[PDB]
Amino acid sequence: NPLFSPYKMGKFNLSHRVVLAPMTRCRALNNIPQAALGEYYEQRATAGGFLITEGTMISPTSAGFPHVPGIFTKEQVREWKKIVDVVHAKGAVIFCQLWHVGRASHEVYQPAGAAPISSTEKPISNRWRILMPDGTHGIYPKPRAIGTYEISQVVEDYRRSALNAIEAGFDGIEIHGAHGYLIDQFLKDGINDRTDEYGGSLANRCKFITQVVQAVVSAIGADRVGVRVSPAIDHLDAMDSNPLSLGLAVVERLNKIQLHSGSKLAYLHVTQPGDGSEEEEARLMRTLRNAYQGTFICSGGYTRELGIEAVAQGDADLVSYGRLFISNPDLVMRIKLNAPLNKYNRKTFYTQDPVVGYTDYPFL
Ligand SMILES: NC(=O)[C@H]1C=CCN([C@@H]2O[C@H](COP(=O)(O)OP(=O)(O)OC[C@H]3O[C@@H](n4cnc5c(N)ncnc54)[C@H](O)[C@@H]3O)[C@@H](O)[C@H]2O)C1
Ligand SMILES: Cc1cc2nc3c(=O)[nH]c(=O)nc-3n(C[C@H](O)[C@H](O)[C@H](O)COP(=O)(O)O)c2cc1C
Predict the structure, then answer these.
(1) How far is CA 13 from CA 20, 168, 309, 310, in A?
(2) What domains appear along the chain, each with residue ranges and CATH number?
(3) In the chain, at which end, N or C, are there fewer CB atoms within 10 A of the end residue's CB?
(4) Which numbered ligand comes closest to the C-alpha of 349?
(5) Choice from 57, 235, 272, 347 to test ligand 1 binding pocket (greatest atom count within 8 A of CB)
(6) Which of 96, 92, 90 is CA-nearest to residue 12?
């Protein structure tokens, strides 16, 4: 099974290619990593396996979900260190995903109830609703379009968060540039209506992600930086008029960052709609992989068989699984044995209980 062949993700020697995709679970009460997260990640960690954490706040204004962890305070760093240590005790490699939601927020999630920030002043349309802390679904508000000095401040929040992740012991970080969140609000021409140097052309729309990646590369080293994008996921109004062209423009910028810094990123991670079309989606994924000079993680709707095929055919180096890892803590082992997989309960994806729907899914 080629999913169980080793792979060198730059400095990290992985024993297999099954990756834990980043998943927000909302157990990090008051944005502080909790003991329950340590139990959750330890259950899923394997010797030589790679894990990516749930999206993690880079600043007080970066959240749009309840009880998501941060890594912008030293208290958060101390609590993350305990979690990273239990994962490393199982021999796994773990990256912290750095996440800013941009306009996908609400006053309940912002300090002083201030407006969320974005590339644009337009709200997400009322086709979409935000999960509120009380479990109801609310209305996304009008965001504030930020100026270019404030863009450079957000880049610095990424840089400081990356340094804090290294202080907590993480092996690296992943830039969350997917799903209609802040970076994607700059990338996608269905959101970015700016008329300054961060809007309009492909080069201008790619400036923000290039600056974020370059800042974290300079701070922690390219080999400790992964980047996640989703050119053809339209979540939260995030559509582009030419998704492949946009994806190839992002890939070209990552290739140039690597050339200019003389080192390769840890990986490019591309995610696609995850609910079953097939040939077209596989061609987009392979085209982005073929354009990128480095390690490629594919994601979204992969099965055991599709993961094996992706690696065997050279279409990806690593395969990330999200939802199946919620309910199969030993998913790596189940994939190795071809053992039946257990269902997940969507109702407890984003609840706060430290056990129920979080660490109580059994092993084989
Ligand atoms: N937590 C996060 O940041 C989410 C970001 C994006 C993807 N999320 C989850 O990943 C998994 C794979 O997502 P997939 O690519 O399959 O698409 P969905 O986001 O599920 O979109 C399917 C349709 O569901 C409706 N829908 C999804 N989210 C919202 C929302 N927030 N408000 C209103 N409708 C919503 C829309 O019809 C979508 O086309 C799903 O469990 C999904 O809920 C997680
Ligand atoms: C509950 C839940 C939370 C998620 N949170 C994140 C997140 O924090 N960051 C991210 O990049 N993607 C997030 N995702 C998307 C997943 O990483 C994954 O790409 C998606 O579920 C599709 O892969 P799958 O078909 O293997 O589940 C989340 C998905 C779910 C279902």
Answers:
(1) 16, 21, 22, 20
(2) 2-348 (3.20.20.70)
(3) C
(4) 2
(5) 235
(6) 92
